[PDB]
């Protein structure tokens, strides 16, 4: 039997319903999401990391001159400094006083840390949505499996076939461009490859951490060696990756709305409480028992013994009943006024049973279904004492949930009196208008 319904996109809050198959006793169904994962499709654009400046041994030409040539090296620099007279540990290196040249060379490489300490720039496109669903029904214990939240792919969970509809909201916390560094994700419109500026995030760009074509854009400039010293001095703009790591700011992990939890393997946003999720579950035909084979419950009377509209199961109610064929009978409240903690109760030939519920209404009025029967529960609920709690609300608050009977009474008096004032004035006008007509005629 296929049961179709819509459940909210909430994690840790179970969805409860009664599967009512004509001719069979209701089968209690409970569907709880363990996690919801939005897994977008990503394409690695390039990898950024701290650069290393490689400086080969300078060519010191004594009594002569040399010339620089271009080479296929990132940010390659070459300059010939004439008029040098370097000294070594063994004395003057060159003979001529000024007819000597030192050719300095330098180029940018990926540092050793780039294998581990680097940021991956990704293009993010709409991907897939998956969830872990925990389901129990009738006398079948909790079973779970990974499912695809697409409304098409069915999943077999404990002999039951579950189809989870697509999320009503297509919202995703990732922008078209994200930067992944370590365990953190940043929404960052990184520069296109080959466009990174010196001292900025993209100063060093590589298509992959093992590529042999590196883009480097630093103001690497060779300076003249100090008088008499064989060395290759240079100036360069400090690494824009090191700068970025200082100024990264808040990661997406700390600013994603709806409480999303960001994971990287694969990149995904977990437990985003957005919209609702249509569902369809085909319950096995063996889970249903004929009406005549289940207990008949009658003379139901529901008394609310205690109630507070707290986020926990603050309500307590006692239901008196009369029955036959003592046995288990499911309990459910079809309306959103109250969420019942217990899923089923054991009924004797006569007596009473108690159940707990959570409600946001100051004067809750809800229907309670006891298998083949139902009763209406009414009462008053006190305000909760705790200002802050460490758990989410089980119930749902409606527009009129907070309006007390006293507030309704004042609204009725307001509208009734206000309307009567205008109505009486209009009637008086109509009566005098008729009298004036009869005066003329």
């Amino acid at each position: 039997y296929e049961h179709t319904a819509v459940m909210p996109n909430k994690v840790g809050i179970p969805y409860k319903a009664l599967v009512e198959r004509p001719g069979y006793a209701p089968v209690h169904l409970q569907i709880q999401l363990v996690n919801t994962r939005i897994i977008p499709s990503t394409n690695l654009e390039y990898i950024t990391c701290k650069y290393k400046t490689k400086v080969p041994s300078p060519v010191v030409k004594c009594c002569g001159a040399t010339q620089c040539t271009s080479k296929p090296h990132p940010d390659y620099q070459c300059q010939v400094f004439s008029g040098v007279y370097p000294f070594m540990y063994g004395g003057a290196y060159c003979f001529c006083d000024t007819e000597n040249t030192q050719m300095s060379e330098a180029y940018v490489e990926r540092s050793e840390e780039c294998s581990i300490d680097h940021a991956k720039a990704y293009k993010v496109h709409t991907g897939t949505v998956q969830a872990m669903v925990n389901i129990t029904y009738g006398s079948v214990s909790w079973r779970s499996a990974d499912v695809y939240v697409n409304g098409e792919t069915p999943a077999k969970i404990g002999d039951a076939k579950l189809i989870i509809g697509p999320l009503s909201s297509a919202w995703s916390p990732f922008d078209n461009k994200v930067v992944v560094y370590g365990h953190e994700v940043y929404n960052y419109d990184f520069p296109e490859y080959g466009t990174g500026k010196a001292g900025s995030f993209g100063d060093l760009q590589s298509r992959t951490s093992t590529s042999n074509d590196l883009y480097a854009n630093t103001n690497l400039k060779l300076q003249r060696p100090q008088a008499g010293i064989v060395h290759t001095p240079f100036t360069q703009v400090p690494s824009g990756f090191e700068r970025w790591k200082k100024d990264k700011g808040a990661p997406l992990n700390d600013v994603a709305p709806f409480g999303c939890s960001i994971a990287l393997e694969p990149l995904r946003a977990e437990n985003c409480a957005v919209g609702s999720i249509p569902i369809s579950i085909d319950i096995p035909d063996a889970a249903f028992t004929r009406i005549s084979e289940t207990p008949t419950v009658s003379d139901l009377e529901c008394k609310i013994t205690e109630c507070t509209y707290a986020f926990d199961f603050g309500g307590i109610a006692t239901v008196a009943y009369k029955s036959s064929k003592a046995g288990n009978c499911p309990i459910h409240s079809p309306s959103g006024v109250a969420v019942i903690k217990e899923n089923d109760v054991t009924l004797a030939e006569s007596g009473s049973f108690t159940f707990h519920f959570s409600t946001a209404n100051i004067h809750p009025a809800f229907k309670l279904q006891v298998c083949t029967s139902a009763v209406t529960c009414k009462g008053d609920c006190k305000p909760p004492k705790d200002h802050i709690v460490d758990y989410a609300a089980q119930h749902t608050e409606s527009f009129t949930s907070a309006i007390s009977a006293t507030a309704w009474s004042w609204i009725k008096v307001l509208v009734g009196g206000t309307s009567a004032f205008i109505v009486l004035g209009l009637i008086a006008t109509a009566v005098v208008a008729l009298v004036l007509f009869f005066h003329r005629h």
């Binding site: 581990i116 700011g249 808040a250 700390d254 600013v255 994603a256 709305p257 709806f258 409480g259 409480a273 705790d386 200002h387 802050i388």
Partner: protein, 52 residues
């Protein structure tokens, strides 16, 4: 890649008021405090707490 032991700041004192969370922070070293709403507007907060 290795596993390093990072400091663990002292547990904050938490006081509760109507729709308000009051935290008394007594850090040993500059400690980052971040918060966000779980609604449609994260309204994130990020500040380094260096003294009580």
């Amino acid at each position: 890649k290795a596993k390093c032991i990072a400091t663990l700041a002292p547990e904050p004192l938490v006081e509760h008021k109507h729709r308000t969370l009051i935290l008394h922070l007594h850090p040993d070293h500059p400690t980052l405090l971040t918060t966000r709403s779980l609604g449609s507007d994260a309204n994130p907060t990020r500040q380094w707490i260096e003294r009580p």
